[PDB]
Structures are given as structure tokens and as C-alpha cells.
């Protein structure tokens, strides 16, 4: 009875997030007995910039999407990416139990309902320079993807360089950066011949939400709403799982290629947390009273 436009921030079909999106949509289609079918378009195939997916879902240009660039529209969710704060999906779950009402409220004001979440692994640290400890970060120029990552690197005595993934190769060859915060299955693989050390400190997750147009979703019968929710809840962890399996595989491959892999340790994590816990509170004050309050609750729940 309907075919819905779907969009993803993934630009090609080989990506684990895109495969996961397909699994979510397949489950929805089966579970609704074909009442809700999808046509998926990949990133760039529609004139929607990645940071504008939430607005495209909210106005119905597309009806369903994954989005990892929602922080511009849902600022209070930035707690979930503060450096060193979350160490596990159990930590995410604890934090999100607190964040959920704020996040659902603010997506809802913008015409969007949240149906699920998945995660990439932690962004960790790679460098062409020796990097086997937190002390080794000092004076290194490290590409970062956010002001929150910049704040971590700066606090660790490094020099953050905000660069997009595409500028990284020539930056490495020219020596204007030494390294980058990224995942093995992200930049690690494609930049791997230009990197030698990997300190697997769990700096922050990159992540996405499964988002549906609120008006289209609320127009479904109660039974079809529940089926759609069930399907996304069932499949979302599989997206996280596939991405995590690939991260492990690529890390093992990088080891065999000669990447020096330095695992994080409890002592190292504690030291790193002590460098940024103060910044979390500064960040929250900049974001306002709700962020301050929510952060207090999250920190109580996580014990850090």
C-alpha cells in the first residue's frame, strides 16, 4: 500500500552501514506484509548534503533514512560523542536512557521520529610518528573530525588539525599532519601505507540513528507502527555487529601489514579521562542548562 523514499549517508553498496540499512528495510517490508516498501537512494544520488538528512526526513523529501550527522539539528545529543565518556554499547545504553526524552523531543519538533540507533567502533589514534602512549601525543599534528576531538588532542598536548578525510593523503605525504583520529575500517585501511602506529584509545564513537518522517509514521495504523518499530529494533544491532566485525578484521590485517597496534589499558583510559573530564563540563555550559543537567545525570549513571 505504499513505497517510501529512503536515503543513507553511505555513498556505496559495499558499506556495512548500507548493508545494514538494507536489512532494516527488508525486515520492515516482510513484517508489514508489504504494506511499507522502500526505494533506497545512496548519498549524493539526491541533492541532500549529509548534514541535511534530518531536515530532509523532517519535511518528507525522504521518509526514512540513517543519519550520522544529526548533531547540527539535535545539539543536546552531542553528549553521546564527548571524548572518553562512552566505552561500550552498555555505556551508550545507560547514557541514552537519560538522553532519549530530550533527543526524541528535539527530533520531533523537527518532524522526525527516532526508530533506532547503531554505532561505528571507537575512533582511535593513528600516526606516522611513534605513538605508543599518551605521552607520545605531545607535539603531534593529528587530524580531527570535530571540535570535541580537537579539545581532546589539545589537552593531550597535540595539535589538532581539522581536516576532512579527502585532504588527509596529501597532508600526510607533505608532513603537515602526522596522523589522524579514525577507525581501522575507516581511514586506517586506505591511509595504512602512510601510518605506522595505532594507539587504540577509545576516544569517541561515530554513530547513526534510523529516522522516519513523523507525519508519515504517525499516519500508519497502530499495528503497522509497532511492526516497523519491531523491525528496526531487531535489525539495528546487526548493523553495529557487522561494522564491529569488519573493524576487527581490518585491524588484524593492518597488524599483518606491520602497523604497530597498542591496545588501550585501564590506566591509559583513566589518564585520558582526567585530561578531558573538565572539558565535558565546559562543553555542557556552552550548550546550556539542559546539557549541564543531562551531562550530570549521564556521568552519575556511568560513574565517571
The whole-angstrom Rg is 20 Å
Number of helices: 10
Q: Determine the CATH superfamily.
A: Bacterial extracellular solute-binding protein, family 7
CATH architecture: 3-Layer(aba) Sandwich
Global outline: globular
Attribute tags:
304 residues, 47% helix, D-Maltodextrin-Binding Protein, domain 2, nine-stranded mixed beta sheet, alpha/beta, 21% strand, 10 helices
Give an account of the 3D structure:
The protein is α/β, with parallel strands linked by helices and 304 residues long. The chain has a single domain (1-304), classed as D-Maltodextrin-Binding Protein, domain 2 (3-Layer(aba) Sandwich). Helix content is 47%, strand content 21%. Strands 1, 2, 3, 4, 5, 6, 7, 8 and 9 form a 9-stranded mixed β-sheet that branches. The longest helix has 36 residues, at 222-257. The termini are far apart.
Amino acid at each position: 500500500m505504499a513505497t517510501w523514499m529512503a536515503y543513507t549517508f553511505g555513498p556505496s553498496e559495499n558499506l556495512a552501514n548500507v548493508q545494514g540499512m538494507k536489512r532494516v528495510m527488508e525486515d520492515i517490508e516482510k513484517n508489514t506484509g508489504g504494506e511499507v516498501k522502500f526505494r533506497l537512494r545512496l548519498a549524493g544520488s539526491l541533492p541532500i548534503q549529509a548534514t541535511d538528512i534530518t531536515q530532509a526526513v523532517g519535511n518528507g523529501t525522504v521518509r526514512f533514512a540513517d543519519d550520522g550527522f544529526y548533531l547540527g539539528n539535535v545539539r543536546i545529543a552531542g553528549i553521546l560523542r564527548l571524548p572518553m565518556l562512552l566505552r561500550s554499547q552498555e555505556d551508550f545504553d545507560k547514557a541514552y536512557a537519560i538522553m532519549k526524552p530530550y533527543v526524541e523531543r528535539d527530533f520531533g519538533k523537527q518532524g522526525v521520529v527516532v526508530l533506532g540507533h547503531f554505532s561505528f567502533p571507537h575512533q582511535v589514534i593513528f600516526s606516522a610518528r611513534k605513538l605508543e602512549s599518551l605521552a607520545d601525543i605531545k607535539g603531534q599534528k593529528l587530524r580531527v573530525s570535530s571540535p570535541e576531538q580537537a579539545a581532546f588532542v589539545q589537552r593531550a598536548g597535540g595539535i589538532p588539525v581539522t581536516l576532512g578525510g579527502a585532504e588527509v593523503p596529501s597532508a600526510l605525504s607533505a608532513g603537515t599532519i602526522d596522523g589522524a583520529l579514525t577507525a581501522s575500517a575507516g581511514g586506517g585501511k586506505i591511509w595504512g601505507d602512510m601510518l605506522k602506529y595505532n594507539l587504540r584509545l577509545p576516544v569517541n564513537y561515530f554513530d547513526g540513528f534510523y529516522l522516519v518522517n513523523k507525519k508519515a509514521f504517525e499516519a500508519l495504523s497502530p499495528e503497522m507502527q509497532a511492526k516497523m518499530r519491531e523491525s528496526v529494533a531487531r535489525q539495528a544491532p546487526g548493523t553495529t555487529a557487522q561494522i564491529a566485525k569488519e573493524e576487527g578484521e581490518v585491524t588484524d590485517a593492518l597488524r599483518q601489514k606491520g602497523m604497530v597496534i597498542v591496545p588501550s589499558t585501564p590506566a591509559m583510559e583513566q589518564a585520558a579521562t582526567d585530561l578531558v573530564s573538565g572539558y565535558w563540563e565546559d562543553w555542557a555550559r556552552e550548550q546550556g542548562p539542559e546539557a549541564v543537567q543531562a551531562l550530570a545525570e549521564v556521568r552519575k549513571a556511568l560513574g565517571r
